[PDB]
Amino acid sequence: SHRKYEAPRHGHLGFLPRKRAASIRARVKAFPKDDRSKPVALTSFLGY
Amino acid sequence: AESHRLYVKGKHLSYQRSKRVNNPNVSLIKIEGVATPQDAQFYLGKRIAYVYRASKEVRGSKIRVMWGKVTRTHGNSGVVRATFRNNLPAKTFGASVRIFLYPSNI
Amino acid sequence: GIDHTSKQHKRSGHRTAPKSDNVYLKLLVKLYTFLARRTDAPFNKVVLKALFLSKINRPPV
Amino acid sequence: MAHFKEYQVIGRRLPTESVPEPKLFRMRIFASNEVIAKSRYWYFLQKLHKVKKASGEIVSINQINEAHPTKVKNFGVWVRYDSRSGTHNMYKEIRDVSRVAAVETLYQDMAARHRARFRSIHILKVAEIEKTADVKRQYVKQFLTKDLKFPLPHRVQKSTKTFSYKRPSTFY
Amino acid sequence: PRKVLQLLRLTRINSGTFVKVTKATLELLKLIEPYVAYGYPSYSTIRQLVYKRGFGKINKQRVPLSDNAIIEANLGKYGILSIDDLIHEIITVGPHFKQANNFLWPFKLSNPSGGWGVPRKFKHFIQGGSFGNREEFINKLVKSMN
Amino acid sequence: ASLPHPKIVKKHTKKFKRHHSDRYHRVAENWRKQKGIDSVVRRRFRGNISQPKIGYGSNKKTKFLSPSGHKTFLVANVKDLETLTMHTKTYAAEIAHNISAKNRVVILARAKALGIKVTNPKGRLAL
Amino acid sequence: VEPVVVIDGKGHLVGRLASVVAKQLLNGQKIVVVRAEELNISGEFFRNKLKYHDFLRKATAFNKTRGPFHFRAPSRIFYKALRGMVSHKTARGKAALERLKVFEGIPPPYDKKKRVVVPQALRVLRLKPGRKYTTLGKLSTSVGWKYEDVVAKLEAKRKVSSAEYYAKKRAFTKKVASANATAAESDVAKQLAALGY
RNA sequence: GAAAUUGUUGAAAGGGAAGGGCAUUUGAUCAGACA
RNA sequence: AGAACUGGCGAUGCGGGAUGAACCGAACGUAGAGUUAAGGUGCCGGAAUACACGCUCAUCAGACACCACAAAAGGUGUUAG
RNA sequence: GCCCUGAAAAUGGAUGGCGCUCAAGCGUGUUACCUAUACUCUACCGUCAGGGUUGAUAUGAUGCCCUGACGAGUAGGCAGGCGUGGAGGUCAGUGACGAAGCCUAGACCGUAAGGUCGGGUCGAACGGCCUCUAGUGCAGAUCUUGGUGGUAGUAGCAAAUA
RNA sequence: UUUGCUCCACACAAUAUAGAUGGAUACGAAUAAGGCGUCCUUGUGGCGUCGCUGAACCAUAGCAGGCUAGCAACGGUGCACUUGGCGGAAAGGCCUUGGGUGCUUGCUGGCGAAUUGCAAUGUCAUUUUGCGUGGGGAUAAAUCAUUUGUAUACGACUUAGA
């Protein structure tokens, strides 16, 4: 049967599994797309 | 010369079987070049030898031979039936087998 | 498959040897079996069937 | 039902002591052998006269051969078929080389286009069309034109071996 | 039909016997039509049946003929004293057909060597099967079973 | 050295084991007929074990014959071994399991002087 | 005949080629399938697109990671149709799957090898002219294949290096065809022609 | 001083059971006749 | 749910219908050889990706008795009358 | 006629699956081929039936030999045999030079119930056959008594201030 | 942790196999169209020719392939070297130069075989490991314990210490 009333889902299903990360430093999965006209420069940096 | 083959190569396909029941006493051999049961009548009665290797050297060699012969044709695509002195171990499905020319009727 | 009309492996239903263990009675059966097999006389075949009968089938005369 | 043949069958239905010398009926049967030609003979005499197999007998059965089996003819075929709902009459035209070959095409054509089996088809009359410009069907008039030429594009060349070392060409 | 088949000595599949055609026997054949196939045999198929599958019934035993003396011993009082006199008594139905036909054991035939020729066996031969009245084409199918 | 006999066939060389004899330790290896109403062995289903029947009987010509071709006979002393002197090519003497070692050297010595074959000549031999 | 058979997958059907190959693998023959991105399926594009969306929604309810895996590569779509024609749950079928290699485009050393075709599975010898067909490369891109442009860029580079090989091979065989022509009109050539050679 | 059960040693197999039937390969082991 | 005739299951395995106590074929001692039934011959799967005449394109095609569903009514989709 | 609309149910999904489009779909025809414990032939086992044979000097007349047909099966009936405890008779039986029992992917015989042998262990009685007798054969009965497992080195050994 | 480890030349033992026994012989594209040759104004050109299967092509003769002689060619091929270039999608291959050496059945010769006794595959692969040979080559880490808290039920994680 139906629930009793409709209610929203608890939590986000895209952030699964909620496990411990493989390293203390998070990976950069994506980088900005290259533009051949621009000069050579870095895309990211590291800090604390 | 560079070739000493005096036999015709063959392929062990499977046992003589129904949809669910198989008979290990009869084996089906696919001869290369034969595609007609009329052309498969030439190979009737020819001796068949299966050559495999073994770990234990019994008579100065590690190669053992299993002998058989051609009994009759099977189907409409040149497949023939073969009965060996001892049945094939059913692990040679698709393995190459040797079909000789004797006893020749030519 | 055979469509059987009668009963398969059915015995004859008649006695072929006496049930008694009398050794002297079996000697008469042995003697009269030879007689009915080699004389072709109807008398000897009646004696064999009469010698196989039970006590109630041989009333006193 | 099989490779057809044409037979003629003559009935006699048995002469009694009151009426001798009966009328000796006859018709033409398209069948596979002499077994079905006699069976299909009694099927139509029970639709036209007071007669059955037990009250009659077969006089003579003869196979009719084609007079000119090597000449292409135009045939007009009248049939009586039974559909799923009702019975309808139909006239069809088949261009073939013999009377027995036009019947073969008719049974395959009626089963493919109308789902009619052999038991539901009655052969009323088959006749050769003597003159042209009498063909009223469009699928036969195409082959009666002067200087008929037509290609066969996309030749599907049947192969025997499983693997071919060349890329096939469908030229003609 | 079960009782009729037992009166024609057809107790198993692919069994054969000769039947004299009369009014009484023609009505017997119409009852067991969906189970038997019959027809008119020629001389060649009758001759080959007795030579290969000919067995006599002597003292309730199935004794192969194999000799002209055994036929003379049991059927010699009705004229027949050879293997061809019995054959002549069959195809030419004479006054002693009942004793000659009953002397022969029912024929034990095998499956036809070329098949039955039809996809389905239990239909009428007119409709495309194998049973019913099937005349002289019966010599082709009997000789394949023999 | 026995009588010429036809080649011996058995038609079933495997032992007949009871159903579920390898599953439970309480079930012995001796053959017991299944009397169950739902048993698949009694109903002769495909892929199950085979039951003993009268069709597996051996030839009467080669029945009770050893592979050597003789018939096994139990011998306890010198007296019963002397009953096989006229049947040397048919029977073979076998010394019983309860015969002492000092009596086997007399049985074996008498058997060699008569030609009677002994199936177990190595029983309780001092070597 | 050959120890390894390399089949060009261009212009072939999925089910007709898979059934031919699956029967050859069970007979003990190693087969390498190249150019799987140019494989064809009968029927128009949107029919086979909906035939993949209804396959894509079939998954295990309580855990989506253990249900049917929906591979998107053209070499794996053809592998899925070939795996279902072989009893892959037994040891006989497991060994037959190690005799098959399917790739997109023409990879290394199989690039310098002779490629054969199957006349029983070709799209030009089976489909009636006028029937609509689709391409596996276009169908795979619409369902999540990320490397349609990478294979197409690498295939154009291979054809440039393959065209220059044929440019000198055709020039070399012209010299051979002229050398034996000058060797004709000789007494050793008439004896060969009398024997059918 | 048996079985259930357990230890050690030796041999063999193991991709979500194990066990079974028919057939053969491989390994181990056994027999016969040598007349 | 309750009757009439007959055949089956129960009491019965075997080949076929993927699967099933009743359906189809056919009923069973132990083996060998040959031929078939019912059902099948693209692959799984033993056997013609045989031959021949046509029909059908479906944005939920269709695919074999018992059998595991489909109708009235419509279509200038196409075919024949 | 085929196809399409009509035609909407809840886990993901089933012409058996893959897949198939001048089909590997549908209607129909012609042949070839695949094989059931079915049919045909042969051998063997058992049963039943019909017969042959007592002649001595060599041994089974319930014996031997010839011929033909047959072989499914629960409840049930009958027949032929295997095994156990004890009793009469017999083998002038076996045994401290090792009886009985027990162990043995060691061997042989019987269709089977079972029987026999070799090896290891063991220490004082036991068997074959012809007959008699019965408290005579177990996998089950939430069976009885006794013993031992998986669970498992797991639950747990935390009230009353230290 | 008693001279171990690594690469290379061969040496012997084992070990494992889904199956060597002349050659996996490389354009692309179209199919109501193309391949090749040739010519020109180089094109969506003109002309000739080919398909209808790989039933092809190359290779193929010698004690499984010997020992030697000559002739005609200056070719063909094997082998270890050597020169240069190309190939990154899994390149691990391909092309080419220089000689050395072996063979040549392109042609003509001379000897050798038997007895393995009338058929019994008649053995001709690479896979890894181990123990002994010697020609070069290289002289480390991790874990526990201690410690830290960006981490933590326990493991794990993040740090630090000659």
From Swiss-Prot, chain C:
Name recorded for this polypeptide: Large ribosomal subunit protein eL18A
Organism of provenance: Saccharomyces cerevisiae (strain ATCC 204508 / S288c)
Domain of life: Eukaryota
Function: Component of the ribosome, a large ribonucleoprotein complex responsible for the synthesis of proteins in the cell. The small ribosomal subunit (SSU) binds messenger RNAs (mRNAs) and translates the encoded message by selecting cognate aminoacyl-transfer RNA (tRNA) molecules. The large subunit (LSU) contains the ribosomal catalytic site termed the peptidyl transferase center (PTC), which catalyzes the formation of peptide bonds, thereby polymerizing the amino acids delivered by tRNAs into a polypeptide chain.
Sequence intervals crossing the membrane: none
Subunit structure: Component of the large ribosomal subunit (LSU). Mature yeast ribosomes consist of a small (40S) and a large (60S) subunit. The 40S small subunit contains 1 molecule of ribosomal RNA (18S rRNA) and 33 different proteins (encoded by 57 genes). The large 60S subunit contains 3 rRNA molecules (25S, 5.8S and 5S rRNA) and 46 different proteins (encoded by 81 genes). eL18 interacts with NAP1.
Family: Belongs to the eukaryotic ribosomal protein eL18 family.
Entry's localization field: Cytoplasm
Swiss-Prot record, chain D:
Keyword Cytoplasm listed: yes
Keywords of the record: Cytoplasm, Isopeptide bond, Phosphoprotein, Ribonucleoprotein, Ribosomal protein, Ubl conjugation
GO cellular component: cytosol; cytosolic large ribosomal subunit
Gene3D superfamilies assigned to the protein according to its UniProt record, in alphabetical order: 3.10.20.10
Keyword Phosphoprotein applies: yes
GO biological process: cytoplasmic translation
Cross-link entry Glycyl lysine isopeptide (Lys-Gly) (interchain with G-Cter in ubiquitin), positions: 125, 131, 149
Residue(s) carrying Phosphoserine: 32
Record Pfam families: Ribosomal_L18A
Subcellular location: Cytoplasm
One term of GO molecular function: structural constituent of ribosome
Domain of life: Eukaryota
Self-association state and partner proteins as the record states: Component of the large ribosomal subunit (LSU). Mature yeast ribosomes consist of a small (40S) and a large (60S) subunit. The 40S small subunit contains 1 molecule of ribosomal RNA (18S rRNA) and 33 different proteins (encoded by 57 genes). The large 60S subunit contains 3 rRNA molecules (25S, 5.8S and 5S rRNA) and 46 different proteins (encoded by 81 genes). eL20 forms multiple interactions with RNA and proteins in the central protuberance, connecting components of core functional centers that are located far apart.
Family: Belongs to the eukaryotic ribosomal protein eL20 family.
Note: Present with 54300 molecules/cell in log phase SD medium. There are 2 genes for eL20 in yeast.
Record's protein name: Large ribosomal subunit protein eL20A
Organism of provenance: Saccharomyces cerevisiae (strain ATCC 204508 / S288c)
Curated annotation (Swiss-Prot), chain E:
GO cellular component: a single term: cytosol
Keywords: Cytoplasm, Ribonucleoprotein, Ribosomal protein
Primary location group: cytoplasm
Subcellular localization(s) per the UniProt record: Cytoplasm
Keyword set includes Zinc-finger: no
GO MF term (any one): RNA binding
GO terms under biological process: cytoplasmic translation; maturation of LSU-rRNA; maturation of LSU-rRNA from tricistronic rRNA transcript (SSU-rRNA, 5.8S rRNA, LSU-rRNA); ribosomal large subunit biogenesis
Note: Present with 101000 molecules/cell in log phase SD medium.
Role, per record: Component of the ribosome, a large ribonucleoprotein complex responsible for the synthesis of proteins in the cell. The small ribosomal subunit (SSU) binds messenger RNAs (mRNAs) and translates the encoded message by selecting cognate aminoacyl-transfer RNA (tRNA) molecules. The large subunit (LSU) contains the ribosomal catalytic site termed the peptidyl transferase center (PTC), which catalyzes the formation of peptide bonds, thereby polymerizing the amino acids delivered by tRNAs into a polypeptide chain.
Quaternary assembly: Component of the large ribosomal subunit (LSU). Mature yeast ribosomes consist of a small (40S) and a large (60S) subunit. The 40S small subunit contains 1 molecule of ribosomal RNA (18S rRNA) and 33 different proteins (encoded by 57 genes). The large 60S subunit contains 3 rRNA molecules (25S, 5.8S and 5S rRNA) and 46 different proteins (encoded by 81 genes).
UniProt record similarity statement: Belongs to the universal ribosomal protein uL30 family.
Curated annotation (Swiss-Prot), chain G:
CDD domains documented for this protein: Ribosomal_L13
Function: Component of the ribosome, a large ribonucleoprotein complex responsible for the synthesis of proteins in the cell. The small ribosomal subunit (SSU) binds messenger RNAs (mRNAs) and translates the encoded message by selecting cognate aminoacyl-transfer RNA (tRNA) molecules. The large subunit (LSU) contains the ribosomal catalytic site termed the peptidyl transferase center (PTC), which catalyzes the formation of peptide bonds, thereby polymerizing the amino acids delivered by tRNAs into a polypeptide chain.
Molecular function in Gene Ontology: mRNA binding; RNA binding; structural constituent of ribosome
Entry GO terms, CC: cytosol; cytosolic large ribosomal subunit; nucleolus; ribosome
Misc note: Present with 43300 molecules/cell in log phase SD medium.
PANTHER family reported in the protein's UniProt record: LARGE RIBOSOMAL SUBUNIT PROTEIN UL13, RIBOSOMAL PROTEIN L13
InterPro entries associated with the record: Ribosomal_uL13 (IPR005822), Ribosomal_uL13_CS (IPR023563), Ribosomal_uL13_euk/arc (IPR005755), Ribosomal_uL13_sf (IPR036899)
This protein's name: Large ribosomal subunit protein uL13A
UniProt-annotated location(s): Cytoplasm
Gene3D superfamilies: 1.20.5.4280, Ribosomal protein L13
Covalent link location (Glycyl lysine isopeptide (Lys-Gly) (interchain with G-Cter in ubiquitin)): 175
